[PDB]
């Protein structure tokens, strides 16, 4: 994973974001929730860089994009085994963000990019139906 | 639905549909308290269906109405889903369709919908934006229930009214038992009233929110002693544990508080940013509690708790812009934890240290509740502070934050008296030789000298004499930065002392009385008051100016001040002295500050007064030096200086020739530094005049793009790499590297027309990477009034976005630059995305006003009635005025409709247009800007925010015109339309108030600029005869000094002699700008009915 | 009739003062270097007009407010500068004739 | 005065400026009371004193909420005063039914009776 | 100046203050008196030590509903910023010398 350089927290944020493109179960997530944990707890000025980089776009912002992935992650953790051990790493790495003025009023949920181009390239409307169907 | 035919199917799942949405909203019934999975799925079905274009093609507000629906029961039941974008959306489509029905035969409709309906519009319309979290909401939502106790008490709880909130709650028994204990409790804690609280608490022991609210008293006190688990309730017991040394009871119980407020955050529906932050705040708190238990589990050192505190001023720090609701309960954690580390400590020299970090954790507390106009908090942070720091010695930094605590509650005596004493305890101590007093005593003696100034309690020379000069004689980052603010503050009241001087001379009190003896000793007398009042003026000019130079070089926080030193370096160019120091110790100042004058420094310089000392060899240097520095920020202003007189040449005054010649010069110096990039900078500019020159008139109908004819040099121009894109904006680097910047590669070869009567021609510029820009290449027309209008809107900007209330609004003025060539060539950015609100609303062809209401009056019917009325009198202007606009409807409401579908976007972007509105609005009036028409003023399609051109007329100008401008703005019934249901109520108004506040904060920076920008000589802002028939188809230095007068009433508040306050003053301004009869007045070209 | 009277006289000031201000000599000067005169004339008549009604109607209301009590008679200050200011106005000269001779005289005296 | 109440302090034990306040709030004029002006405006009583003067009842009941070192009668009297003059009437009430867990104390607590219509307590 | 006398003034500029209006009417009609001749002329002046009307008529107008509104030196004040302003500005000793000596200002 390492190779070709090290990772900023920026890049830490974005491949736990790409991993998280995919979730089979929440409970495989707690290493790398504990990592993401870590990372955040040691670096705060690259927080803060983050933070001042994000503030032309408030509503692509890596930080309210990584906490609203947390809260669903945590969702969707409800009622299985590893129910509290995820809750409590995502309790763990949300402490560290905390009440961080986002600047956005609306939570934007992540939306699959290919869905979107797919459903563009049709034109007709019963050519649509059967590519969401099928 | 599609294949409907005799519409029965859809009156049948009308019906159904209809009558599914009635039985979810009783309340057992027959069908009743159905699930809410089967009520998101239907409205899953009407979201679907909204979105669909109906098979009569039609609008979108059409599109909407596949099936009959009564949009009330909808958004009151998606309101119950708490899916509340959606709910406001579908509150204003009911509201339009309704409004709708009635034209064919708030509170009106909210009593209407009661009747039918049985749900108030206005009280749905309320609990939505109550659910949704925006502040500014709030106000405008309406005013039905404002005699209620409950909403007063909510009104009083957001704006932290909170000793009106207590004596309500106090007062009113009709609140049921629980919610009123609550917010007395609340209100008390919030007020510092702990032992109050903590009594009134053991009076009420003769619900969980009780035993809450308990927990939390009992924690903040540490009391100690008051014994599912909740959350106050496990950092209650955390804390005992800790205390206890019970290590695995403090561990367990922070996790289970961590995983039951997860689980608590998750089971909600998540739909606003809002409902996320009390959570992140707790879980702050819990982790902050959970890292001091490893500081307290193994032995305490000096570095871990160094450490620890410089982790929590970052983290404090990353909270800047966060409400006070959320940093205060983390502050008072850790408060509570320092104290309580302090009282297990056993061991002074670690005392000593952690009696330190709670000092400076207090001081900083103290701080940040006085930022937030908040007054008790601070008084108990001091009270704390003298309870573990006991002093003897007299002098420290929290005895300076006492002080300002106490000036803050306006007890000016008490803050002075303490200031005073400490300034003389400081000087019996020592001769301001030890290092770590230095700090505090510089800043002690400036602020007693500033407090002096605003009290008027001493007399300007015993204030220089004994608090300011000594404070700059008395002054390792923090020593530079008091450095900064000793030289401010004495450059300032220097700066205050010579302006008043020349007031005085310049009054008519002054000549007077010299005329007076105009009519023998007498005049000796004057002479001799004259001279000694000459002499301490130039005292005063000197010290301000040397003073001003020193605050330049220690600090960049007060850059904006350049604009000050370089009015006073300008007026008194002749004085010597004030040359002297420029040319010493102003050629030290970094270049960059001196970008923001560029063009007024430039268009300063000349050739008459040349020598050692002379004030055009320093400004030429000085410009010199700027242009080496910072090539890409002045080369093109010194060459269109140099390119004035180049358009009649390249087709076929003293001061003028002087100007020339002294661009000429630099631009030489520049050539011998960098030649090719002087050569091609020159070759594009010649390029782009060229272009401009060439006539349009030929491919005037046509609109598919023209090619550039192969005689144009521009095509020729090819790998332009020392050149970057004139019109893309440069981020100012202090290093003079600019290695990675895009440069200019090829022009495509295909040309548009943006229409008008000049033809202005678009052409496409790709750069060194694959992106290209637009540019917008103007001839036979004056781009530098636009060059310095986007100057001052850059400046608005940054005072807006330095402000803390402007800057979570995000309220900002939108900007495009502009690169003036010529006197009558240049070209500006071309905002891509950006389409005019005349084109969208008026179109002959496709206009909203068209395809929505098809049976009002057309475009063409208004200007031509009102074009008609305008030879008779103003009763005739107003009935036809009125007749228009009930035949005119506002249609502009649909553009975030039909641009944006998801109902959280849509919420956004018009939520970005009302703070865009707000903004330019106030900006404008401070300016005094005119000609805002439709087709001045374009709205981005992506983000639906405002783009403000065609600066050319500005200060009021539009009022000397024939048929004079009677608006502060444009806020016709289109644009307030455009806000939503509530128009210029709520979110408006209170953008407007911070807009007005921020800028009467700023006064003397706003004051400053606009006096540099005027007397600018190549300025031409004075409206004129040939201007005046064009735009509707010294007495100079006098115009100048009455706009500068009216800007700085306008600035203070005061309004036709009557001073107001900032919301007194935006009330003022709306009901102007709204009022038909100034509507009605103005001219049919500007089209008010729009 | 105070309160009535305390508007209409704000009113009126406020056309004195745009009449007498700096703005609108600068208009007529740049309007001097042609329906543009026209439109000025009729702009002209008709703030003059509104002056004049504005400056009746307080007048009145401040006669009014005299004769009905004693507790605003410091207001006859305000009535006999505007009837002076105003002395060429017929309007103003007959209401002082017909309702003004029914003020106690006892008011008038502070400015005898 | 300053310097004249300190060289009177040093000799005779006396403070001019704290004999004047005395004498100045003991004749009952209410402008007077400002003349006096020294560095015992900073302390807590005499602010509490001023806020009084004032009537800024919310200043006075937050300082004697904060203050301890003032002794407990005259806390608890500030205390209520400002409290009734606030018209904070509950909290009065369950403020004194907390303080049973002086006689300036059963008289405030009378007057609060009469003036709440509390006629259960004898 | 720091007893009753600062707080008497106070009170007293406050009064002023809440009838700006009365003393703005009074005044104006007292200015505009044909007989009342308050403005200087080099006679009075030589005497006092051993239109152009209305203009000055409007600027000493103007300057009283300044001082009434609490305007000095362009800033607004409140009373007690008013009061001090005068009173430092009263018991100035460089105003005093500068003053002329038939005043008596050491008096
Ligand atoms: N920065 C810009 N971005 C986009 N469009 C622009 C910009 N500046 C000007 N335009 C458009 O260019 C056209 C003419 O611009 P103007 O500068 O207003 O020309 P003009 O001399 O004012 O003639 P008009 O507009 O007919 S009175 C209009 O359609 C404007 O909307
Ligand atoms: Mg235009
Ligand atoms: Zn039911």
Known sequence: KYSRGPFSLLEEINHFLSVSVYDALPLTRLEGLKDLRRQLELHKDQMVDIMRASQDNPQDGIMVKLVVNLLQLSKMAINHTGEKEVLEAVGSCLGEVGPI?????????????????????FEDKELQWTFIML | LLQDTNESWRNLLSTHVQGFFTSCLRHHFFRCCLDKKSQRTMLAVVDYMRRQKRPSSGTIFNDAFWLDLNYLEVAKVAQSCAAHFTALLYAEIYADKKSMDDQEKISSLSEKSKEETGISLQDLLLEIYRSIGEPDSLYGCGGGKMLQPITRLRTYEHEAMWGKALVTYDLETAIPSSTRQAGIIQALQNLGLCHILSVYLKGLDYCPELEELHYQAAWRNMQWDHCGTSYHESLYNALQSLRDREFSTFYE?????????????????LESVYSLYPTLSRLQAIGELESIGELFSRSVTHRQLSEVYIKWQKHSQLLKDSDFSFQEPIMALRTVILEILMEKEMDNSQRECIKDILTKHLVELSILARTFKNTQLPERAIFQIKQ?????????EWQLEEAQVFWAKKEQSLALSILKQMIKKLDASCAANNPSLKLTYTECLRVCGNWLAETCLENPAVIMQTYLEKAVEVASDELRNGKMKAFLSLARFSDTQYQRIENYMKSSEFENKQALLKRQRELELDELALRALKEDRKRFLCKAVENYINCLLSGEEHDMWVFRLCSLWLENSGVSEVNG??????????????????????????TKMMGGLGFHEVLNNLISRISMDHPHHTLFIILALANANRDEFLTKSQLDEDRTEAANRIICTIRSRRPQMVRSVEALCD??????????????????????????????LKNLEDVVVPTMEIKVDHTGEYGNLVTIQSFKAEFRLAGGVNLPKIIDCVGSDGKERRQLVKGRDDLRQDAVMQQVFQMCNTLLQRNTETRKRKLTICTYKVVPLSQRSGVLEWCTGTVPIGEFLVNNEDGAHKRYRPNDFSAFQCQKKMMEVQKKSFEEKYEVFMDVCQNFQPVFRYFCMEKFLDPAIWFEKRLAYTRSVATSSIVGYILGLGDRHVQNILINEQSAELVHIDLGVAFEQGKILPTPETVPFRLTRDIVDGMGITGVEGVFRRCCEKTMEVMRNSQETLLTIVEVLLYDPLFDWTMNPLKALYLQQQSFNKVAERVLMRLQEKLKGVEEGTVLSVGGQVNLLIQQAIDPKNLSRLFPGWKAWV
């Open chain 1, 101 to 121: 003025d986002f600047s956005t009023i609306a939570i934007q949920h992540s939306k699959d990019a290919s869905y979107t181009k797919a459903l563009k390239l």
């Open chain 2, 388 to 396: 573990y720091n006991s002093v003897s010695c007299g002098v420290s």
């Open chain 2, 253 to 269: 119980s922070l996790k289970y508080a961590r995983v039951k407020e997860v689980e608590e955050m998750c089971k909600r529906s």
């Open chain 2, 687 to 716: 390029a782009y005049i060229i272009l401009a020159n060439l006539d349009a008139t030929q491919w005037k109908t046509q609109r598919k793009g023209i090619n550039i004819p192969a005689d144009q040099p521009i095509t020729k």
């Open chain 2, 581 to 606: 120091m420029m040319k010493r110790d102003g050629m030290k100042i970094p270049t960059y500050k001196f970008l923001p004058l560029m063009y007024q420094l430039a268009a300063r310089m000349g």
